[PDB]
Amino acid sequence: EPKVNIINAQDDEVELMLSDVNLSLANSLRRTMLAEVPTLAIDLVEIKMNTSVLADEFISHRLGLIPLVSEDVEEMKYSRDCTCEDYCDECSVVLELSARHEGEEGTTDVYSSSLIKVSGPGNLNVGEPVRRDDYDQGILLCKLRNHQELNIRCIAKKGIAKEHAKWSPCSAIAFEYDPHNKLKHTDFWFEVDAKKEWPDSKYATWEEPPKPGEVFDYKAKPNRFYMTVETTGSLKANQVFSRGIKTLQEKLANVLFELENSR
Amino acid sequence: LETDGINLAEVMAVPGVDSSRTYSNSFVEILSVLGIEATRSSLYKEILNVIAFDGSYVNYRHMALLVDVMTSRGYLMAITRHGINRADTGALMRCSF
Amino acid sequence: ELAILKEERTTTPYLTKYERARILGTRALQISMNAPVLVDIEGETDPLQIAMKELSQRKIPLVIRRYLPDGSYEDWGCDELIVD
Amino acid sequence: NLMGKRVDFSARTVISGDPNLELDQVGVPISIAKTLSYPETVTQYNIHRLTEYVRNGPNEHPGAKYVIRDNGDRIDLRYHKRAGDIVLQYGWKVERHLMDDDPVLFNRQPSLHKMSMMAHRVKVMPYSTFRLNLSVTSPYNADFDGDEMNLHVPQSEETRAELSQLCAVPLQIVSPQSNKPVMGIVQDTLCGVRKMTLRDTFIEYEQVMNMLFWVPSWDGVVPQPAILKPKPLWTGKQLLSIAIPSGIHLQRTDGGNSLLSPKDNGMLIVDGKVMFGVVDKKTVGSGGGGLIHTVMREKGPKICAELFGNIQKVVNYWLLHNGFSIGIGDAIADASTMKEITHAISSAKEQVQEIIYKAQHNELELKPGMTLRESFEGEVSRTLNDARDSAGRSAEMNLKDLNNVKQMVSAGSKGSFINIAQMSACVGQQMVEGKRIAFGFADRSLPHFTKDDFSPESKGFVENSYLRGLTPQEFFFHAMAGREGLIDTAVKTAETGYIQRRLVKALEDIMVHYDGTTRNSLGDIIQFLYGED
Amino acid sequence: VPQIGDKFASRHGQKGTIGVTYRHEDMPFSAEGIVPDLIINPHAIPSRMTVAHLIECLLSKVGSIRGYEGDATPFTDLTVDAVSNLLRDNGYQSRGFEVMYNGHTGKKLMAQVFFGPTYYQRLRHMVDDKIHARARGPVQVLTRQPVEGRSRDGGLRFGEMERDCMIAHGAAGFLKERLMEASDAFRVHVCGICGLMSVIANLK
Amino acid sequence: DPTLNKTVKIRQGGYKGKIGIVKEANGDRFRVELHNPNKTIPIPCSFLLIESTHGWVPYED
Amino acid sequence: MIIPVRCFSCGKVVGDKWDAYLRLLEEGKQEGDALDELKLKRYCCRRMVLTHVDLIEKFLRYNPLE
Amino acid sequence: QKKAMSSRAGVSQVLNRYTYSSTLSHLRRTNTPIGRDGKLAKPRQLHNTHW
Amino acid sequence: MNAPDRFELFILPDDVPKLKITPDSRVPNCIIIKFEREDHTLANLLREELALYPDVTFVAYKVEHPLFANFVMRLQTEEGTRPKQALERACASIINKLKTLDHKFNEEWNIKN
Amino acid sequence: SALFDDIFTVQTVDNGRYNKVSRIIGISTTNSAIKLTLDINNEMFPVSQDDSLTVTLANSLSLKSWRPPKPTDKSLADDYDYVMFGTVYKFEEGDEDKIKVYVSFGGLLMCLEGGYKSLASLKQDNLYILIRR
Amino acid sequence: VYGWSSLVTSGVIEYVDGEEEETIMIAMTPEDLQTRSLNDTAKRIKPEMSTSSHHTFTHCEIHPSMILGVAASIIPFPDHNQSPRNTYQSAMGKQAMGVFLTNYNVRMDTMANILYYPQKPLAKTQAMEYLKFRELP
RNA sequence: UAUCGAGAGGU
Numbered sequence A: 001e002p003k004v005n006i007i008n009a010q011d012d013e014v015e016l017m018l019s020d021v022n023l024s025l026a027n028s029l030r031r032t033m034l035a036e037v038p039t040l041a042i043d044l045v046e047i048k049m050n051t052s053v054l055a056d057e058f059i060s061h062r063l064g065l066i067p068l069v070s071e072d073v074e075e076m077k078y079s080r081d082c083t084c085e086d087y088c089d090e091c092s093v094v095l096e097l098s099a100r101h102e103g104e105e106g107t108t109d110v111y112s113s114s115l116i117k118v119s120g121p122g123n124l125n126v127g128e129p130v131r132r133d134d135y136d137q138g139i140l141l142c143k144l145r146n147h148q149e150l151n152i153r154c155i156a157k158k159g160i161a162k163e164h165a166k167w168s169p170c171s172a173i174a175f176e177y178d179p180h181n182k183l184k185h186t187d188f189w190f191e192v193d194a195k196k197e198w199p200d201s202k203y204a205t206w207e208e209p210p211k212p213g214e215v216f217d218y219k220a221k222p223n224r225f226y227m228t229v230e231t232t233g234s235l236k237a238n239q240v241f242s243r244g245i246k247t248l249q250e251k252l253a254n255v256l257f258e259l260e261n262s263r
Numbered sequence B: 001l002e003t004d005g006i007n008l009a010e011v012m013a014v015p016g017v018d019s020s021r022t023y024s025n026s027f028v029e030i031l032s033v034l035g036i037e038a039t040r041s042s043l044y045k046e047i048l049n050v051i052a053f054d055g056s057y058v059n060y061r062h063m064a065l066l067v068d069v070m071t072s073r074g075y076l077m078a079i080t081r082h083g084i085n086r087a088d089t090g091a092l093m094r095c096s097f
Numbered sequence C: 001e002l003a004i005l006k007e008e009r010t011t012t013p014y015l016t017k018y019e020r021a022r023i024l025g026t027r028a029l030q031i032s033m034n035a036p037v038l039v040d041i042e043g044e045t046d047p048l049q050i051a052m053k054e055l056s057q058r059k060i061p062l063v064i065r066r067y068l069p070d071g072s073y074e075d076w077g078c079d080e081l082i083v084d
Numbered sequence D: 001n002l003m004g005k006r007v008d009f010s011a012r013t014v015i016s017g018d019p020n021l022e023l024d025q026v027g028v029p030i031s032i033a034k035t036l037s038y039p040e041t042v043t044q045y046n047i048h049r050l051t052e053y054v055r056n057g058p059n060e061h062p063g064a065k066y067v068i069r070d071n072g073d074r075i076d077l078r079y080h081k082r083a084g085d086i087v088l089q090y091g092w093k094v095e096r097h098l099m100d101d102d103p104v105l106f107n108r109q110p111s112l113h114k115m116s117m118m119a120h121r122v123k124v125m126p127y128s129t130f131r132l133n134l135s136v137t138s139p140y141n142a143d144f145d146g147d148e149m150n151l152h153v154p155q156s157e158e159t160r161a162e163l164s165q166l167c168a169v170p171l172q173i174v175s176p177q178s179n180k181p182v183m184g185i186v187q188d189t190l191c192g193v194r195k196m197t198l199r200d201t202f203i204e205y206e207q208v209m210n211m212l213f214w215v216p217s218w219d220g221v222v223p224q225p226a227i228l229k230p231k232p233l234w235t236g237k238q239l240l241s242i243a244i245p246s247g248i249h250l251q252r253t254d255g256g257n258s259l260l261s262p263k264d265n266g267m268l269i270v271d272g273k274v275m276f277g278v279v280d281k282k283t284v285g286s287g288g289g290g291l292i293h294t295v296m297r298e299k300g301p302k303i304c305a306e307l308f309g310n311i312q313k314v315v316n317y318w319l320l321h322n323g324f325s326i327g328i329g330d331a332i333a334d335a336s337t338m339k340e341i342t343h344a345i346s347s348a349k350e351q352v353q354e355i356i357y358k359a360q361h362n363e364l365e366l367k368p369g370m371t372l373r374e375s376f377e378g379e380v381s382r383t384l385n386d387a388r389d390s391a392g393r394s395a396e397m398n399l400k401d402l403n404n405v406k407q408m409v410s411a412g413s414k415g416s417f418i419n420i421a422q423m424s425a426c427v428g429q430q431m432v433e434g435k436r437i438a439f440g441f442a443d444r445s446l447p448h449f450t451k452d453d454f455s456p457e458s459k460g461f462v463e464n465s466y467l468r469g470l471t472p473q474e475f476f477f478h479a480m481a482g483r484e485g486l487i488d489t490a491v492k493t494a495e496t497g498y499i500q501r502r503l504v505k506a507l508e509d510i511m512v513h514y515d516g517t518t519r520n521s522l523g524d525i526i527q528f529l530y531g532e533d
Numbered sequence E: 001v002p003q004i005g006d007k008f009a010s011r012h013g014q015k016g017t018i019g020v021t022y023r024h025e026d027m028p029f030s031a032e033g034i035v036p037d038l039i040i041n042p043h044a045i046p047s048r049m050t051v052a053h054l055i056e057c058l059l060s061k062v063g064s065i066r067g068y069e070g071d072a073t074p075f076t077d078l079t080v081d082a083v084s085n086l087l088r089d090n091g092y093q094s095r096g097f098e099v100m101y102n103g104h105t106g107k108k109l110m111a112q113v114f115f116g117p118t119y120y121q122r123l124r125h126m127v128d129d130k131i132h133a134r135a136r137g138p139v140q141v142l143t144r145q146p147v148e149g150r151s152r153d154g155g156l157r158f159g160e161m162e163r164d165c166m167i168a169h170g171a172a173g174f175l176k177e178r179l180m181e182a183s184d185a186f187r188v189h190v191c192g193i194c195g196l197m198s199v200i201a202n203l204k
Numbered sequence F: 001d002p003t004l005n006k007t008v009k010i011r012q013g014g015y016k017g018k019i020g021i022v023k024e025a026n027g028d029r030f031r032v033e034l035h036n037p038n039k040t041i042p043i044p045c046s047f048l049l050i051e052s053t054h055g056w057v058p059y060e061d
Numbered sequence G: 001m002i003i004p005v006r007c008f009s010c011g012k013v014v015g016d017k018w019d020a021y022l023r024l025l026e027e028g029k030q031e032g033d034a035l036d037e038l039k040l041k042r043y044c045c046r047r048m049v050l051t052h053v054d055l056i057e058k059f060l061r062y063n064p065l066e
Numbered sequence H: 001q002k003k004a005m006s007s008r009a010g011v012s013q014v015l016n017r018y019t020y021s022s023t024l025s026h027l028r029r030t031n032t033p034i035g036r037d038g039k040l041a042k043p044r045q046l047h048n049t050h051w
Numbered sequence I: 001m002n003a004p005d006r007f008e009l010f011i012l013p014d015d016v017p018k019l020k021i022t023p024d025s026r027v028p029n030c031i032i033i034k035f036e037r038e039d040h041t042l043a044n045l046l047r048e049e050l051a052l053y054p055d056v057t058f059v060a061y062k063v064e065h066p067l068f069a070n071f072v073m074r075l076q077t078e079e080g081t082r083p084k085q086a087l088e089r090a091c092a093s094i095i096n097k098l099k100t101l102d103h104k105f106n107e108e109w110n111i112k113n
Numbered sequence J: 001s002a003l004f005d006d007i008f009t010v011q012t013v014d015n016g017r018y019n020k021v022s023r024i025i026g027i028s029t030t031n032s033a034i035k036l037t038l039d040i041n042n043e044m045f046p047v048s049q050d051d052s053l054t055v056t057l058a059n060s061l062s063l064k065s066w067r068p069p070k071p072t073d074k075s076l077a078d079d080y081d082y083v084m085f086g087t088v089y090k091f092e093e094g095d096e097d098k099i100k101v102y103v104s105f106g107g108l109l110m111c112l113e114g115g116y117k118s119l120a121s122l123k124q125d126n127l128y129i130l131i132r133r
Numbered sequence K: 001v002y003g004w005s006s007l008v009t010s011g012v013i014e015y016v017d018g019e020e021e022e023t024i025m026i027a028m029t030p031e032d033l034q035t036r037s038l039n040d041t042a043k044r045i046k047p048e049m050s051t052s053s054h055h056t057f058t059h060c061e062i063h064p065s066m067i068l069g070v071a072a073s074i075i076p077f078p079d080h081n082q083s084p085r086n087t088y089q090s091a092m093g094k095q096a097m098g099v100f101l102t103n104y105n106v107r108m109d110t111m112a113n114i115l116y117y118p119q120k121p122l123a124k125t126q127a128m129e130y131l132k133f134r135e136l137p
Numbered sequence L: 001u002a003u004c005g006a007g008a009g010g011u
């Protein structure tokens, strides 16, 4: 009975209409994609040298925000559930960065592309700093001047955005329904005329406006939910939507298990 | 009639004036002309007028208690050291003020 | 001399809010020091709770000595003072 | 050092509001609850509980800091490495951490009256602020813009009982100051309860179920909807009534309304159920004879304290899912009303010209007791203040029911007529020392005017609204009046503070005695019977 | 890092402390999926009459859409209606409102929300620089009463007005305890004849 | 006790992989002063690795 | 201080667009159009780049202290 | 130094550096040395000639 | 300083059950389920699903305090059905709807390739 | 099986105040001096002026905790379009034969005027009102 | 060089103190130097100035926003606020974290606060250019 | 874990 219509698609955003589901299911899917879909992200920074003008934890905070390839992260374990001491090769990716400015002139800009993967759970596709193109330097991290050096060792771990927003695969998620307000779920503020003063939905042409005679259908419920899922590149937009569905399922499955064990 | 300035005794005597109702907003003058029980009522009236002006309301017993303290000695005890500390209260109590 | 006879007592036959708070607290303290309790102790074992149970049954073994301004006094037992 | 002093077992931090705390609770940061302590005597009934606290130690909650022997020797649990090998003896004391439902005295300065110090039940909570139910902000005069408040921990069974049995928040709901409550429904909950109890507010079943479950005292019986067919719908008045205890009757008439209440004003409550009437500040505020006053007299302080929480939990839920806002739009009157406003101010400026003409041609009536110039300034002031009130009334009437400023004014939760007037129509005449702006330059108010100019604009009439914006002259004149307000607040606070101290010292020893008399420390009769009744 | 209790203010005398934080998905959101950094309360506005705060929000919305810093100099020809005209030409309702959705349920809010950028200030007042509690601790040599100040493990002053409050409550035991056991209680010996503290007392 | 003030790594729990210093080791339950945020946490001594001459050694140092 | 990695409000990466934004301004584009070309559609994201101030350029002038 | 009383206090102050705006204001501040004893209001008012 | 570990939102302590069911004896056939380390995400999803069942007579949930990641749900079913069973059915019902939803997205995705 | 029954002609329909409620006044087609003032939900049961409306007042729908109605059971409301349940808060036994019955349907108000013989059964604690057409 | 003092010594700008200000007539803006022909319900009303038939202006304000000092110059639209709110911000603005100097790393001050990511405000005033507020926000 | 002052601030 659930129906899907992909309006547009690309690597980092999918626009789609979702229908024949409950509002609560579309919303719980929205929340799950924002908050609980795992990704990989730097979570421990070993600073061996930092003579830049930036503070150690200033830099560490930016490092955590660098999006890393998280495609195979589902097969990867959480550090808190791994039997090893400290971190290891089965529950983390290790990245290293080393920058320096040689020369008495100019400024060296340190980019996320200088982050070099050193180990990781082979041969899983996880841990590479996301790149737009092949010529893409990525995210600016720091800047160096004569004799200033940056030498760090980073431990990346699997996590979810409930713990820290850096583990979210999304940015915004656009989300709306009932573009003509037939359900009367909002009551518009106006000075002179509400219809002239409020802009049209970008999905106004996807449903038909109410006819001037039409009586109020007090039995209609929301049923068509237009949403666009943007991502940071740690996961592709179709992956976030798919794993969102998967994650919400396991959460319900675990509840069902616990009920069938309380017997 | 209402006046600027007071002379309660002389105005009371003026033929035509209801000598049983003439009032002054100086309760010090009321005490000299009409006595301490009239001063008690006048003191309450003048305080109430202050409180009631900005629409406020204070229960009678609080203002009644204050005006009874100010008149219990038979003269007007100011709410200052010159009134309060002229009491036969202990020295430790009086020196804490 | 100073004591006022039971038949000539004129003060209120109700326990005052101040007498109640002091009686409950004082009795609570005595209970936590293992004073004999005059009611059954079930599940509620805090000293204040036991003291409140004794109060509700008129079983707190204390007397209010109410001083009058002249120094004379009426002794009232908490068994005889009316509790709301 | 003697009438007041610094004390142990005290604490202070920034305050925050919490919609999910009972009226008589205070949320206490964990770190504070681990620093403060209460010395509990060890008995057969608590020795197991208290040994557990001792094992947890001073740094883990619920824990303990000291063990006190009958001799008085304290055992410091920070430095005892064999804390598990401590055996408590009856009669010892354990200085345990502060814990849930411990009574504590809570206080915001300045402590102007007795409900500036009330006893709350501790609730230990994360984060570093003290949490208050919003309905106790009024007696404390507290808000959350940086205010801090103080907490004091009683140290014995006797002083705990004085707090819980005399000073506790619910005992303080009605104050002897004006024989009326000092706490009511405020802010979000008051704004929301008007919106929720509007005659055309309807709630579908699925939301009704959540709202019912949010009332802790709900009896579990879903009431029949006001509309059964074609769709089950409950009204806002029905769900608010869940929060009102049974046996509560209240009647109020607004503007001679009938029992048919066409305007949905007045108030009628029967057996704790709202028959008609928008529920607003006139019903759930702190006024005498309202709902809170009535439940207190009829049900006592415990039920009345739950009333705040019940009302809050239903309304705040409904408002969370309804929404409410305010924007720049709500200050904007339509072009027709602005033209009335601008015309009426223009004609008031003309009347001021006529008054200037009469006074300057010796044709002005002198008021008794007043010089010519006093009479002139008085007539000019009445004209200009009536112009502002008249322009505000036009702006007020033009605002729709949906106008967000109007909704807050109508709930009684924030704002008043003058705020609509000054934001939308006209700020009006600026006063300093009871008079229009004085000629601080020689025969003029600013070097931008000619001498001997008594017009509205010359002596501080601000014609524009805050929406339109003030001119440079108006700006300065408005800042002159505004400075005077800051000066008054800074000065007269010490004037009244000294007054209150002298009042307290005059009266501090005056007590009601067991013979009914009111006497001082000398036994002098001040009143033969308190309040004469 | 900002937390509950820290203080913030716009440039219009409109100040507040953080009451709670909500994650991205619990915030209200617009159809475009924009969520606020910060939600202040409508009751802060009508009695304070800080209309500049509202106008600043409107102009700043326009400015970030069109790519410039709006001119908010006082005493210019700029009007609210002119800024509203620009905003409407950019696809938003002209007075700054937006339809928004409750984060818990996904349902629209019955009310539209004034929404847009406003310049906010991080003030020096942070709760963890103020929080303080004292059980026991150091006293003054001369009075043996607790020392003054957070920075010295001090105790709060129970001043004369707090004394008066406890008198009004009739809490005689509590007031005695505050001012003795919780402060400078001391045992002295006096002579029953002359009443002076001239007694020489060897207790062992 | 011989492990106070000595540097430590945590091998179990929510703080796994984090550096710290033994601030107080009364018995069985230690207090490690984490490096990363300004907080000293309670942790069992079983959860710690101590630094010694050769690498991180469990509580056999 | 230096361009933030993410938009505070929505999380979209903007730390890889600072050089491209300065370049579009050298090429004579107006700020609004440059933001448009960079695909910064939500006004939360536009604020991030439009109002950032690059202070690290000032801090670098202070001759390194090692 | 020997006349620390009767001398005026607060003429020199530690330069406020909390933020850049606060430094600019501190360098442009003025003081009226009237006191705090004797309330009045007249020197505290915003006088017309302050424009 | 008094901030809790963020992992406490979703990691269940070992002595703390994900789920605890008790009766509400004030009405017949009603249970209270306390969910630990869960959100509106789970609670609102279960709630609507359950409310549309014909044999569910009451369903509601509340997050009693936003600073603590738990919620409590109240569920009553008609005499025929047992409340805990209806909850089990809602779980399996929603898991199925999401399986369908995952399939139809996969198909629609290849179609758009 | 009902307590009161009649047909009313709508004389006035006041919207004004609310977007979802209107107050209507009607007079019995069969008996003048029997007047009905009633608040109703615009969106659920839209009425216009001069509409003919059958109004029934019952104390039971039978031919304590509310539940969504089962499709199998059957009640008096199956034959009407719009049903409300309310509280009788005033039974006015006035002079001559001017009798008023005031009912609150969750704040949607009704006053029914008429004679004792037409309204004596309405002296109830609660009333349903059922409206047809 | 031809700068500010060139205007002062060429008779187009002069300095006046409080005493000399007593004897001059100042127009608020250049437009007030000449009489006009409006009725735009959005913009603010200008005083009529109908007490003198003909005004003889001696000077004109350069800009009226220069009556403000450093702190109040940070307020956007102070002409739309109740005047005490402008006083309150003038205090709080001095309590707002930013970047107090660019050399904070080489100063060892008793206390210093630096906002991680300062932004310049979307709503600014002309006077902020001279305060450097957009450069050290 | 000092004392006496001063200055700037918070509600």
Ligand SMILES: Nc1ncnc2c1ncn2[C@@H]1O[C@H](COP(=O)(O)CP(=O)(O)OP(=O)(O)O)[C@@H](O)[C@H]1O
Residues within 6 Å of the ligand: D109, D110, D141, D143, D145, D493, E047, E048, L011
């Ligand atoms: N100098 C002072 N002396 C004594 N008490 C003061 C004080 N300054 C502030 N207070 C206390 O703090 C209160 C001031 O509250 P504010 O937050 O300053 C204004 P308000 O009247 O509550 O709100 P507003 O900002 O909406 O006008 C006083 O009523 C008093 O309780």
Ligand SMILES: [Mg+2]
Residues within 6 Å of the ligand: D142, D143, D144, D145, D146, D147, L011
């Ligand atoms: Mg305040």
Ligand SMILES: [Zn+2]
Residues within 6 Å of the ligand: A079, A082, A083, A084, A086, A087, A088, A089, A090, A091, A092
């Ligand atoms: Zn591992």
Ligand SMILES: [Zn+2]
Residues within 6 Å of the ligand: E191, E192, E193, E194, E195, E196, E198
């Ligand atoms: Zn002697």
Ligand SMILES: [Zn+2]
Residues within 6 Å of the ligand: G007, G008, G009, G010, G011, G012, G042, G043, G044, G045, G046
């Ligand atoms: Zn963004």
